[PDB]
Amino acid sequence: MIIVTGGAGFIGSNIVKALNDKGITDILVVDNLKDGTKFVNLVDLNIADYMDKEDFLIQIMAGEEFGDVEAIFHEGACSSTTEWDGKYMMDNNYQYSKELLHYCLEREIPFLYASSAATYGGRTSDFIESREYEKPLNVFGYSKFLFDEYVRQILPEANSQIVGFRYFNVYGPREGHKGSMASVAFHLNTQLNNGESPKLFEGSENFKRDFVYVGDVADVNLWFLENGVSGIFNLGTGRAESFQAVADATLAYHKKGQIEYIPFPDKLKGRYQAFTQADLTNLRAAGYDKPFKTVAEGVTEYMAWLN
Ligand SMILES: NC(=O)c1ccc[n+]([C@@H]2O[C@H](COP(=O)([O-])OP(=O)(O)OC[C@H]3O[C@@H](n4cnc5c(N)ncnc54)[C@H](OP(=O)(O)O)[C@@H]3O)[C@@H](O)[C@H]2O)c1
Ligand SMILES: Nc1ncnc2c1ncn2[C@@H]1O[C@H](COP(=O)(O)OP(=O)(O)O[C@@H]2O[C@H](CO)[C@@H](O)[C@H](O)[C@@H]2O)[C@@H](O)[C@H]1O
């Protein structure tokens, strides 16, 4: 069996789908369904069982066996960059991930987890997977950073696979529950379908991100499970594109709309990455040689799915 935490969430449900496509259905999903609308992310998929994140943690820490576990994809986390309860954040993200890591380590279970490009903080180049390039701008980012640092202390003596994926700006199907944390592409689609003006933050001209399609993210995850390589790896296209480019691809699909620029949100000031671009050197050197969908490709495919 395979365990996917955050499996009812965006990236996690996409990993579940990718597993299904390879004929794998013996899957335990661990998540938090408090927001019950997330069920749609699993409704068309095939899994073996569901467990709440709190029950899972209790059983993990008690040393319960879940069967013959082939791997844990740990996508489960508080994913909100605007959540400032750091007690909860360090607990639900950092500490939770440590407990799971040690559980897998004791049993030689491959452990593939979610990092974040938020760890890089404010930066105009050299998004490289090393401590000197890392300086997160929020506590979410810190929770991710500190766990990556913890993993680095553990790697040299791990006897089983440990892989962290430093996701950049992931977008695509199954993120409709994320609200304000959903991709700009999703927000633009929603706005256009509601007869509202599509909205970008003021200054978005000069804002760029490495937007990466969730389908590719899932593919990378499965490739690493198949190939057994350990480490911490950037996961993006390696190309930075403006939010305008995402808007252009979205408006082109809808064949209507005019971007309205809104005030830059106050709670994001001093907390915002104006630029990201994955350096894929280490990812390629690991053996992952597949191309990534561009914004034009991915967003167009995404809009077709959404509509
Ligand atoms: N999507 C992106 O652009 C992006 C970029 C970089 C990194 N990431 C990371 O990738 C992972 C998945 O992101 P996502 O976009 O899929 O977000 P998501 O849709 O919110 O998926 C996370 C899911 O996990 C649940 N959860 C929270 N803590 C958990 C835990 N300890 N164990 C199991 N489940 C838990 C969440 O519920 P509750 O929060 O309500 O408890 C939510 O349903 C996260 O670690 C996120 O930080 C995502
Ligand atoms: N330029 C522009 N225009 C309109 N809306 C924008 C925008 N930039 C960002 N947004 C919206 O605000 C949400 C939060 O901004 P960020 O703090 O920069 O969050 P991210 O863009 O990095 O997206 C988050 O990434 C982390 C991974 O690090 C995930 O865990 C989160 O779930 C988010 O996906 C944006 O979501 C956007 O809607």
From Swiss-Prot:
Induction and repression of expression: By heat shock.
Catalytic residues as annotated in Swiss-Prot or TrEMBL: 140 (proton acceptor), 178 (proton acceptor)
Modification N6-acetyllysine, positions: 267
Residues in coiled coil: none
Cofactor binding description: Binds 1 NADP(+) per subunit.
Functional pathway: Nucleotide-sugar biosynthesis; ADP-L-glycero-beta-D-manno-heptose biosynthesis; ADP-L-glycero-beta-D-manno-heptose from D-glycero-beta-D-manno-heptose 7-phosphate: step 4/4; Bacterial outer membrane biogenesis; LPS core biosynthesis
Binding residue positions for NADP(+): 10-11, 31-32, 38, 53, 75-79, 92, 144, 170, 178
Any one GO molecular function term: NADP binding
Enzyme class name: isomerase
Biological function: Catalyzes the interconversion between ADP-D-glycero-beta-D-manno-heptose and ADP-L-glycero-beta-D-manno-heptose via an epimerization at carbon 6 of the heptose.
Domain notes: Contains a large N-terminal NADP-binding domain, and a smaller C-terminal substrate-binding domain.
UniProt xrefs under PANTHER family: ADP-L-GLYCERO-D-MANNO-HEPTOSE-6-EPIMERASE, NUCLEOSIDE-DIPHOSPHATE-SUGAR EPIMERASE
Protein known as: ADP-L-glycero-D-manno-heptose-6-epimerase
Organism of origin: Escherichia coli O157:H7
